[PDB]
From a paper:
Purified EV71 mature virus was heated to 56°C for 12 minutes to produce A-particles. To elucidate the structural rearrangements that occur during the EV71 uncoating process, we have reconstructed high-resolution cryo-electron microscopy (cryoEM) maps of the A-particle (6.3 Å) and empty capsid (9.2 Å). The A-particle interior contained density corresponding to the RNA genome, whereas the empty capsid was completely devoid of internal density. The A-particle two-fold openings are larger in diameter and the internal capsid residues link the protein shell to the viral RNA. The two-fold opening in the A-particle has a measured diameter of 9.3 Å, whereas the empty capsid has an opening of only 6.4 Å, a 2.9 Å difference. This size difference suggests that the diameter of the channel is linked to the presence or absence of RNA. Over all, these two-fold channels are broader and more open in the A-particle, likely to facilitate the release of ordered RNA, an important feature as the termini of the picornavirus genome retains large amounts of secondary structure. The A-particle shows that the interior surface has large patches of negative charge at the two-fold axis of symmetry with minimal interspersed positive charges. In contrast, the five-fold vertex is lined with positively and neutrally charged residues. When the capsid interacts with its receptor on a host cell membrane the pocket factor is expelled from the base of the canyon. This release allows the capsid to expand and open the two-fold channels, leading to formation of the A-particle, in which a portion of the N-terminus of VP1 is tethered to the RNA genome.
Enterovirus 71 (EV71) is an emerging pathogen with pandemic potential. For human enteroviruses, binding of an entry receptor triggers a series of conformational changes, resulting in an “A-particle” that is primed for genome release. After endocytosis, an unknown trigger causes the A-particle to expel the viral genome, leaving behind an emptied capsid.
Numbering used by the authors:
A (entry chain C), B (entry chain C): 1 to 239
C (entry chain C): 1 to 60
D (entry chain B): 13 to 249
E (entry chain A), F (entry chain A): 73 to 210, 218 to 297
The structure:
Amino acid sequence: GFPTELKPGTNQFLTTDDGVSAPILPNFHPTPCIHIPGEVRNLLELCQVETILEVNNVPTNATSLMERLRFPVSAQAGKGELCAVFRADPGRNGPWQSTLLGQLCGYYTQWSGSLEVTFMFTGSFMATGKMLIAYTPPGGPLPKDRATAMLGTHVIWDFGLQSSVTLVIPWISNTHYRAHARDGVFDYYTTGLVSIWYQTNYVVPIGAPNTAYIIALAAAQKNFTMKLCKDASDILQTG
Amino acid sequence: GFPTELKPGTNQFLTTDDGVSAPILPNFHPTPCIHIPGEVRNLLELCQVETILEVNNVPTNATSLMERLRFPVSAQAGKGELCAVFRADPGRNGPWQSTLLGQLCGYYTQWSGSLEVTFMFTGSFMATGKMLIAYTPPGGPLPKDRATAMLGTHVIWDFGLQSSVTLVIPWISNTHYRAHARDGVFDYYTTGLVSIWYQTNYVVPIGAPNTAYIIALAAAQKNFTMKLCKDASDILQTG
Amino acid sequence: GFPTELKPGTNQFLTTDDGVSAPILPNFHPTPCIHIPGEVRNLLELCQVETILEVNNVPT
Amino acid sequence: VAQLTIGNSTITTQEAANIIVGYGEWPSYCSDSDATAVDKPTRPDVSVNRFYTLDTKLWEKSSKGWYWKFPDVLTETGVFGQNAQFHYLYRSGFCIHVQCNASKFHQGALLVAVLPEYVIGTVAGGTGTEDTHPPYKQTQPGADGFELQHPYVLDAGIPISQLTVCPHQWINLRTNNCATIIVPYINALPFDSALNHCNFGLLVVPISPLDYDQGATPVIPITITLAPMCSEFAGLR
Amino acid sequence: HSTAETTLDSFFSRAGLVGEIDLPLKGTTNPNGYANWDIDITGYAQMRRKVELFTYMRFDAEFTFVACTPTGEVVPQLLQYMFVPPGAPKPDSRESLAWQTATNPSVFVKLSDPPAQVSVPFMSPASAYQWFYDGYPTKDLEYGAMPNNMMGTFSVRTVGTSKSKYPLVVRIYMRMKHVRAWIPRPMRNQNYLFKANPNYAGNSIKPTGASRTAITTL
Amino acid sequence: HSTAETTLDSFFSRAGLVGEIDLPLKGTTNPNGYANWDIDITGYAQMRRKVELFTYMRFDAEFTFVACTPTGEVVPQLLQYMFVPPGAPKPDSRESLAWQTATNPSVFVKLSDPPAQVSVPFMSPASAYQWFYDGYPTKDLEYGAMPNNMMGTFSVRTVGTSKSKYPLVVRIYMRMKHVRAWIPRPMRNQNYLFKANPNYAGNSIKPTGASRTAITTL
């Protein structure tokens, strides 16, 4: 016959090798692929969808869980008071775990791209005021007050004019390698910071609730990317 | 020599793999294929042939077996009486097992297409009357009487005008999967229903038999198809 | 199938044989090669660089 | 403002907010070269495709959320509940419209979305050791709908904080009252039992609780008017 | 700049272990030197929650078979792996004529011969395997039962009339190839209780993720 | 929309087991460490009724040989599978010079070497193997005997002068390739009594299929 020399690797079964194998049913014509609505092709499609960010990820009591979904603002907050705060950490625990984006991030090891958090004022329509939502880039420390936050990337939101406002988080990268406990994890360190202050107090006329809630939705821009699949989960199929 | 790497699957003997093997007799010139009449190429050719439907599949006594082949109609049946009834179930037991179509269906797991049942009045030529042959689509319950059957797909057959009449069964599909006993069988549920009523009584003049028989033949249209071979049989080669 | 005859050398692992082997991570897109200054290609580049000759290689 | 009419059904609505066409596809019909070219599937135009306005559910501070199953919500109602039962196969689309009638002094937010194959998983006995299958009143709640009990997991062990991944639209009281959606037939099959299978389910949950000072009407009438689009049937019984 | 890693096919390939068969000599476990494994892709723990991201999928699956003794040792034993497509009948005994039915593909391989490997197609009669079903197949114990998702059964056994001389362990891996998916839906945040339904533990309802003290302390 | 599964070649491929040879050490069964198996395609139960759908057929057949010990174990034994075309003489003893006749193809393979596999052609001198014959070869015991349907004989044996050291079992599978068929006829509805004739049991004459009570009760 024809001359050969088997090279090392012969007979190995690589869980990742993606060659072809013999068909079990050679004659079988599998029922045709028809048209189904909403076909997903690449997962990054889903990363660009907005999902509620549980910023108020504090109540854990079983029937208050519907509250992590929206934080509130009220008349009782003096001008300059810190309303809320969280980091630009899609992967790591906390608020981002509720967002779909965060959830996908868990099947990947590295990633980077611009994020986008949109806020929604769902209070009475008769309410007005202003909020100062500031972003303190990675490394920068949470501004001491509303004034110092007013000197860095910020946005005065008059929920009196527009019911919605969207903020773009320029960049976040989870690529710096950490070999802490004994388990080497690829962590941020790029914990950007989003602070929210009462620029003015909550002004509402008589007859309107003195407390409104705000919902914060999040998604990743189109410049987003992920690398290295890493199947991981606390919820697996039970016996 | 030339570099290789044997991949998993090497040395396996698949009963279905259809590769080529070395000829035992390399010089041998097998005697030429001459022309023989009636060559069959695809089995569906045979599914379109009419075969007697044992609608009257009730007599089992050894020498009455020639009766399952034809049911009868007589003077004694009042207008509206139910003459006969069966389902559009080529695979499953009963009347269809006698048809060649039914018999082939047993070597296949899934299938679907339009059927066609033709009736033949073989009574005296001096007889007349009318029959109402109605089809109650899958799901629809057997009509209570001749009147309610008269409201759904039906055909008044005057065996006084035409000796033959053909009915088309629009569609039947044996694809819904059932895991009952412990043996997972692909069954209909599309049991269409063919009912036959005496629209009028059997009118015959003096000198003519007061009983005629009818033969029902069946075949599948051209839109028929079968999938997944499943060799199965009660009759196998004996020791 | 197709006829073969394995020739001597089959199954040997030569530390110098430079064939190809199956990729462990087939989907993985390794981070891009950017431009870094002073790239060395052949070692003889370095042999043409002047380095101090310890002629007075006596004091220890 | 301006009123639209489809037959004998005349609803009064706003000019044209932003509609949501689920998955960008329009409830179209099914062409001739399908699986049943023999039993021509008759396409109900006349009254079958008109405006059905359901028993307005009342919003409260304590409301958990509501959900209806499709086509279950109508297989009960009218001349479409006539075809849905006495017909063997079905394929349809839906112009769903949800409205709130509340003053500029009530506040709230409703997320309105559509979820295919919405399979209700019950609580399972509590501790988790009872394989209880939801009743038939929870699996197909008619046109009265049904109240989620565990809105956070959508009574199916899934975070609602992610439901926006389905066709949805918001009903913030301070910005809008009406919310509209167009749903295309969706299933792994061209046709299917309109009784044994609820292709999807309409979900409308209060994400920002309804609130108001004392004196203002305590409830917000949520009116759900909906109508079939390029709906098709086949095989009478 | 590239985004190929996040594609469905990428996300899903890789052979994952979805099944393990024990054929001990002395045992309560598979006493007849044979076994039946209706093909379940939930065998790979991780898998259940991953696929349940969508409502409809479609794919082919390349299976690879790894067999040895418990110490992970190799032996001179022959084996018959048989595939009984859905609809066909599974062997009830170590001598059921089902072992001989030609329409039940079978691949014979010696334990020494590297892993046997075969591709199985998109069986389902429906246009897609669908993970959720809001109905009943024509309060009922048949809710959410999408039937037409059967991939088949894999019958494993030592070859021969007599019991095999050794204790054996077959492992079934499965690479999913040519994956297409539709209708995406909320990631399971609650623990799984049963293979069939989304039934969760109404007592132990947990927040999707970690919590903190105040919405002002990071 | 496709109909390729219902083609003759499709319907008939697949290697089916048509033969099994026992070569025990201690036995009444094949005491001389050798065996002769005139090629019969009725060995696969199912097969007899399938082919008898037609009157004339034609085909080639790829045979694959699976050999081991009863426990389904593999051993270091060599084997000689020999094919004695029709007309040639079968070996009468474990040393019949028929084993050496070059015109009797023989393939030698070690038990360890994967299954041996060979294609045999359309032997028959007639233009087609024909299942039924309404006559006698030039009340007689030679009715329905279509002679020119001989495919050959397969002589199996351990190689060597002396008896083999192990108990052996050869299995012969057979894939039918390039199948052409003519003249279709009524599916056998009555149980088979003999290999040669359609003789049925005149006492136990059964209705083609299940029965019911009335032609009005379903």
